[PDB]
Design a protein around this ligand. Sequence first.
Ligand SMILES: CC(C)n1c(Nc2ccccc2F)nc2cnc(Oc3c(F)cccc3F)nc21
Length: 337
Amino acid sequence: RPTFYRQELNKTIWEVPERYQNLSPVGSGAYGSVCAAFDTKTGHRVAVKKLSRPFQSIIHAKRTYRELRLLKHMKHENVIGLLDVFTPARSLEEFNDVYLVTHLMGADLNNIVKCQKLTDDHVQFLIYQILRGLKYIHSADIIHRDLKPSNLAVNEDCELKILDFGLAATRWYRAPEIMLNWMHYNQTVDIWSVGCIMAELLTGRTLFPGTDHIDQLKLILRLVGTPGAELLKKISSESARNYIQSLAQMPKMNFANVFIGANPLAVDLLEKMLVLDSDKRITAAQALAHAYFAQYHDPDDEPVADPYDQSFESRDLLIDEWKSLTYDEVISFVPPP
Ligand SMILES: CC(C)n1c(Nc2ccccc2F)nc2cnc(Oc3c(F)cccc3F)nc21
């Protein structure tokens, strides 16, 4: 066991290995707090996240386990993965804190609206990297479900990694089919969000700034138009069918209009990402093969993930069971070279 030191940072004790120096708060959430630090082993800067109250409840405990399992699996250039995982606990019985370590990027995509705007080449590069990361995640049968600019960590080289949770509205970037319920959807819900993000990078404006879930649907249909019979027939919920139809009727807009100026290949890709019908939306793999990315696409370097076991998601276990499972995963961690 390495030597650990303690430090108070904004009202909580951080207890970390001496290896991590110059802890500097980046920010917080409901699920945890993150400090930048210097890793003396590598001479690289890292992000250290201290989970907030990991075994407060079965929902905290299961989320803690899910986060550790996910982060241990992700091994891709465009997805945040794990450099280290530690606890000051020397046994199961004293295990109440979990810390996770990743490479520090320095900013997120949303705090790149500082830039004033991006050239088409920069949009191509950033969206290419998101889609490359999503290909990999999606291939493990994982769906992000909350992709937004604050979930995309970007360094000064414009390299990008997908985060599970960022600092800091979800609904602005959420797909219409999961706006009211979770009955009929797939991994392309993340593609919708990528479309929304791409639009905002090209435009400097949030595409669909809805004030609530029904206003959100309203703004969405104003762009893509009210659905025809072929989509309405797949909506189970009489409540959802009625909101969609009760707008009035709206023509699909000309994306060449709303995105004039843009590379028409960008516009064409957007029209394929922002398809209302979940079953017809382009996948991450299909999107990477689009001509918009001809400068970056290489099918030989767009890997898929090893098989990921998410059977635990179906399980209803006791806080102590989630906690033991989490502990095993901490003990079994092997750092990358
Ligand atoms: C701040 C937080 C969202 N965060 C995480 N979280 C995290 C997730 C899983 C395991 C360990 C972790 F520390 N890793 C980060 C890497 N890089 C950056 O960069 C920044 C930035 F420095 C300031 C603001 C926005 C960012 F994305 N943020 C990271």
